[PDB]
Amino acid sequence: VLLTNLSEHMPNDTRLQTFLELAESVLNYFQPFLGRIEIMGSAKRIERVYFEISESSRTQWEKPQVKESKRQFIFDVVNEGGEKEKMELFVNFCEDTIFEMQLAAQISESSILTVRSALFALRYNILTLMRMLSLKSLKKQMKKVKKMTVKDMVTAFFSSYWSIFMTLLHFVASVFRGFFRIIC
Amino acid sequence: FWKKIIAYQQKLLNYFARNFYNMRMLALFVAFAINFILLFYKVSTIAVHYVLEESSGYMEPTLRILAILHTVISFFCIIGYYCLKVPLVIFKREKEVARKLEFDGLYITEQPSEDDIKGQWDRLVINTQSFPNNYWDKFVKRKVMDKYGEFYGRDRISELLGMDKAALDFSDAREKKKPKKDSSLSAVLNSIDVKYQMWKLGVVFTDNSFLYLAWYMTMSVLGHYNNFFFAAHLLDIAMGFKTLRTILSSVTHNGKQLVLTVGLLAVVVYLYTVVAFNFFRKFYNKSEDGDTPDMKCDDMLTCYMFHMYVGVRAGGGIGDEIEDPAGDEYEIYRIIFDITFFFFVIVILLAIIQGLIIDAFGELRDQQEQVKEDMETKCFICGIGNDYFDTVPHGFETHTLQEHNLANYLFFLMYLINKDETEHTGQESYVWKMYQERCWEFFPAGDCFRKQYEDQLN
Amino acid sequence: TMSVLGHYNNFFFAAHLLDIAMGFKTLRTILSSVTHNGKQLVLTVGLLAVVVYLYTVVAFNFFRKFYNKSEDGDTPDMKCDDMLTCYMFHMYVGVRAGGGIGDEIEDPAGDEYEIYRIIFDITFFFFVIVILLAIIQGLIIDAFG
Amino acid sequence: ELRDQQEQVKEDMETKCFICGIGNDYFDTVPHGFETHTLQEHNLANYLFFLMYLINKDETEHTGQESYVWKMYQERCWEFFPAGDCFRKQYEDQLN
Numbered sequence: 045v046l047l048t049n050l051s052e053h054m055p056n057d058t059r060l061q062t063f064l065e066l067a068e069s070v071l072n073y074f075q076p077f078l079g080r081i082e083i084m085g086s087a088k089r090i091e092r093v094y095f096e097i098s099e100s101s102r103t104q105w106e107k108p109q110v111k112e113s114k115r116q117f118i119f120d121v122v123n124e125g126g127e128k129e130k131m132e133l134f135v136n137f138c139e140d141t142i143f144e145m146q147l148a149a150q151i152s153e154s155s156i157l158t159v160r161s162a163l164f165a166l167r168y169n170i171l172t173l174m175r176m177l178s179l180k181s182l183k184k185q186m187k188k189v190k191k192m193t194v195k196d197m198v199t200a201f202f203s204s205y206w207s208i209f210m211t212l213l214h215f216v217a218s219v220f221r222g223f224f225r226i227i228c
Numbered sequence: 229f230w231k232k233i234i235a236y237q238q239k240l241l242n243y244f245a246r247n248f249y250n251m252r253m254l255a256l257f258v259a260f261a262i263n264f265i266l267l268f269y270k271v272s273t274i275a276v277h278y279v280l281e282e283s284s285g286y287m288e289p290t291l292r293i294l295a296i297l298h299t300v301i302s303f304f305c306i307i308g309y310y311c312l313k314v315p316l317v318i319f320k321r322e323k324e325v326a327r328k329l330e331f332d333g334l335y336i337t338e339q340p341s342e343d344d345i346k347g348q349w350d351r352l353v354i355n356t357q358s359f360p361n362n363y364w365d366k367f368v369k370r371k372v373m374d375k376y377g378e379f380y381g382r383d384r385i386s387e388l389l390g391m392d393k394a395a396l397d398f399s400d401a402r403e404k405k406k407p408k409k410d411s412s413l414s415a416v417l418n419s420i421d422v423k424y425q426m427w428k429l430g431v432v433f434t435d436n437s438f439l440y441l442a443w444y445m446t447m448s449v450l451g452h453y454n455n456f457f458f459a460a461h462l463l464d465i466a467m468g469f470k471t472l473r474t475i476l477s478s479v480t481h482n483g484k485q486l487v488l489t490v491g492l493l494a495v496v497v498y499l500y501t502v503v504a505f506n507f508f509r510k511f512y513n514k515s516e517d518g519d520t521p522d523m524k525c526d527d528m529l530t531c532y533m534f535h536m537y538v539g540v541r542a543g544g545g546i547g548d549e550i551e552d553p554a555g556d557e558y559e560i561y562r563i564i565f566d567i568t569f570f571f572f573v574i575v576i577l578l579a580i581i582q583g584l585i586i587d588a589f590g591e592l593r594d595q596q597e598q599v600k601e602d603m604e605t606k607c608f609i610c611g612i613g614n615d616y617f618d619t620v621p622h623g624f625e626t627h628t629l630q631e632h633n634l635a636n637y638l639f640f641l642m643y644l645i646n647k648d649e650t651e652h653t654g655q656e657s658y659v660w661k662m663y664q665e666r667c668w669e670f671f672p673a674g675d676c677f678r679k680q681y682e683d684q685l686n
Numbered sequence: 687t688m689s690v691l692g693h694y695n696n697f698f699f700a701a702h703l704l705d706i707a708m709g710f711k712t713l714r715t716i717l718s719s720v721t722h723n724g725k726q727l728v729l730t731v732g733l734l735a736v737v738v739y740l741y742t743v744v745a746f747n748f749f750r751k752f753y754n755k756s757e758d759g760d761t762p763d764m765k766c767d768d769m770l771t772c773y774m775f776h777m778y779v780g781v782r783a784g785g786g787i788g789d790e791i792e793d794p795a796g797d798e799y800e801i802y803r804i805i806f807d808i809t810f811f812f813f814v815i816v817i818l819l820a821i822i823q824g825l826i827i828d829a830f831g
Numbered sequence: 832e833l834r835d836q837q838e839q840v841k842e843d844m845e846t847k848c849f850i851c852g853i854g855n856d857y858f859d860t861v862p863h864g865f866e867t868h869t870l871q872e873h874n875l876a877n878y879l880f881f882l883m884y885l886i887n888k889d890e891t892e893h894t895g896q897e898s899y900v901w902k903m904y905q906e907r908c909w910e911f912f913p914a915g916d917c918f919r920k921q922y923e924d925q926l927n
């Protein structure tokens with residue numbers, strides 16, 4: 045807190061910056077717990093105040109229902125709100141939120157299989173499509189390509205994508221059968 | 229030999245990729261022609277014989293030729309997709325995996341959630357020697373090696389990333405010289421990376437558009453067995469014409485709200501059916517003959533189906549379709565029943581659907597207006613308002629078309645990527661390093677040349 | 687030309703009442719709601735025809751027995767034995783019907799396809815009678831806005 | 832009307848700070864200035880945490896600033912909330 049105050053009140057000090065690099069680890073550790081607000085102080089001047097935020101307070105504030113309460117309060121104050129009572133309504137909301145977060149803290153006590161089946165179907169069906177290259181069955185294709193035919197080229201080109209589409213059909217069928225077995 | 233086979237294969241790939249969209253519209257035109265011919269299709273007579281009835285008699289060869297042509301065009305559209313859109317999908321996936329490896333440690337620091345099929349499937353591509361096949365950054369493995377090798381372990385990082393460091397060291401050191409002959413067919417076959425092709429095929433199969441095109445081809449094939457299976461291809465008009473996109477968006481903008489409204493309608497109708505089944509059973513005789521009464525509310529399921537099917541579709545509610553309540557001890561109760569059913573179901577809920585569609589229209593129009601207003605009033609890059617630049621005549625447009633053009637920023641990224649790293653100047657090297665570390669501070673935010681040199685320029 | 691033809695047939699003078707739109711600019715702003723999204727309205731009608739054609743395909747392939755429109759048992763007037771006749775029946779009668787095609791076709795009780803035909807009628811009512819006419823409603827109101 | 836109310840809430844929260852009420856452009860003169868201001872300097876969550884800390888802290892252990900804010904809070908005087916002013920606006924020339 046001391047170093048943060050010094051750095052933020054002397055922003056152009058090279059020596060202070062070097063001290064900040066020397067103290068980076070401690071500042072990084074205490075960054076979540078360090079609070080920072082601005083108030084109009086007794087000297088008719090805007091003063092920046094540093095305080096401590098607790099881990100329990102942070103967790104209870106990040107609880108989803110507290111976030112819903114915050115959103116509802118913001119909606120209300122923006123729509124049916126006047127600037128006279130904005131800071132009064134905000135303080136009331138803060139008090140209620142503090143009480144409910146303390147209550148939550150004190151009451152606090154100290155698809156996977158479908159995805160796996162789909163992945164298995166992918167693995168198996170792709171392995172079937174690749175066994176033709178794995179088996180080294182290219183002797184047959186080599187025998188057809190002893191002599192060039194543009195018709196042979198076109199036939200092989202279309203056959204490759206046709207085999208890919210058939211493999212996709214098998215994959216879809218496998219996924220459907222697996223999903224039926226799961227839901228059964 | 230091979231240098232010409234591969235060349236002609238590439239020529240065919242390029243042709244199909246170029247004509248993917250033309251073949252995409254041709255498939256819709258042929259589908260419309262087939263479905264127009266199918267309007268002259270008659271039942272002929274104990275098996276019923278579906279017969280194409282026409283005076284000319286030539287529409288049957290026309291139908292078979294059109295069906296065969298539609299199947300061929302569907303296959304060619306699948307090929308065109310594989311030639312044109314699949315590379316973009318693979319590039320995006322490879323980029324995302326690389327970024328999550330480098331800046332997130334998706335397979336070093338923390339592991340996938342086992343609920344992300346994409347995350348689990350992307351585990352395979354890491355070990356492949358053909359990684360960034362499409363993504364430009366070929367040094368992602370080296371970047372991850374430098375970032376996490378000294379802390380998480382050099383050997384296990386190398387094993388995860390599929391790098392042979394010992395072989396690399398031997399190659400850098402003294403090594404024998406070995407030729408490489410690409411003409412060998414065994415070499416051609418063993419060159420391909422099986423595991424990377426497996427991962428790519430998995431990504432393609434999980435791609436939604438490829439699945440839709442496969443469904444299109446399957447329906448086209450089934451159309452030969454039954455010609456009325458060609459009617460499913462008329463559902464392609466929504467994707468074919470973006471003019472139907474904006475009409476259907478009104479329905480799909482609040483589709484969840486519409487589904488919930490239908491569910492609420494079913495719940496309200498179920499409550500009304502409960503009330504009728506408990507108190508107004510005598511009034512649900514639907515048979516006019518006195519011999520056999522057809523009671524529609526003696527069973528809960530039958531009464532609920534009667535309500536949902538007949539009363540909701542009825543203009544005045546269930547009271548339009550159930551008996552008259554005059555001269556009964558529950559006359560006032562049943563009048564309240566019918567009036568409330570008409571008001572809540574026929575009027576209010578259908579009004580909710582009306583309002584949802586109209587509000588979707590209005591919201592989409594407001595979003596378009598907001599986009600136009602933002603682009604007309606503030607610069608995309610710096611974010612400064614139009615008035616400051618407009619102090620000089622045409623200043624905003626000069627700034628947004630010469631100084632801070634997003635097209636110019638895209639062209640700079642292309643030029644910097646396609647330029648050799650050794651040839652980079654000082655500014656280019658600075659921007660390149662920040663881009664490689666994903667630091668977007670070089671983008672001018674809140675400042676510009678005119679604002680920095682305001683007094684010197686003027 | 688219409689004024690000249692009116693002498694030969696006096697009812698040709700009724701086409702001149704179409705001139706009120708241009709004569710009164712107050713009707714300009716009412717008709718602009720229709721004409722602001724005229725292309726969208728035409729596309730909505732085309733989509734309605736496509737959806738009704740799909741429903742007619744389904745009925746022609748599975749629900750032909752229910753389209754007898756003649757009350758006399760002597761001669762059945764089958765409205766879906768032909769694809770064109772079934773499509774015209776749908777577009778003309780079912781769309782104009784308040785509850786859909788189920789208001790005008792036979793009752794499905796006591797049949798093996800009862801649930802399928804109930805789904806057919808309910809979906810027809812929801813998509814055609816409710817949603818699409820709602821799209822036209824929204825187009826006109828959005829043009830006003 | 833409900834959609835317009837939600838849009839208005841979003842627009843207000845995106846264009847002006849909740850506490851001081853100063854527009855986003857003034858802070859945005861510095862890159863990311865508005866977001867830095869609304870997430871570090873004038874965070875309503877930070878203001879709530881300060882109230883919790885000041886309530887849970889012993890009154891004897893209060894510092895000068897804490898005692899000042901505590902007295903104003905007990906008298907329900909919200910003048911300490913910065914309205915129309917901030918650290919950056921007060922020290923505009925000194926900071927930059």
Ligand SMILES: Nc1ncnc2c1ncn2[C@@H]1O[C@H](COP(=O)(O)OP(=O)(O)OP(=O)(O)O)[C@@H](O)[C@H]1O
Nearest residue numbers: 603604606607608609624625628629632633634635
């Ligand atoms: N960084 C920017 N780059 C380009 N235009 C910008 C930028 N910032 C704001 N604009 C504004 O965006 C508008 C240009 O729109 P845009 O280039 O997206 O397409 P368009 O004008 O709708 O037409 P087209 O598709 O033919 O290019 C102009 O009004 C321009 O002032």
Ligand SMILES: Nc1ncnc2c1ncn2[C@@H]1O[C@H](COP(=O)(O)OP(=O)(O)OP(=O)(O)O)[C@@H](O)[C@H]1O
Nearest residue numbers: 111844845847848849850866869870873874875876
């Ligand atoms: N005093 C303030 N404190 C916090 N945010 C503020 C303040 N003034 C304006 N904002 C703006 O409000 C937005 C933050 O919204 P908010 O914290 O209410 O929740 P959110 O972003 O909708 O999401 P979440 O519920 O996850 O926190 C930012 O755009 C921020 O600039």
Ligand SMILES: [Zn+2]
Nearest residue numbers: 607609610632
């Ligand atoms: Zn700019």
Ligand SMILES: [Zn+2]
Nearest residue numbers: 848850851873
């Ligand atoms: Zn503020």
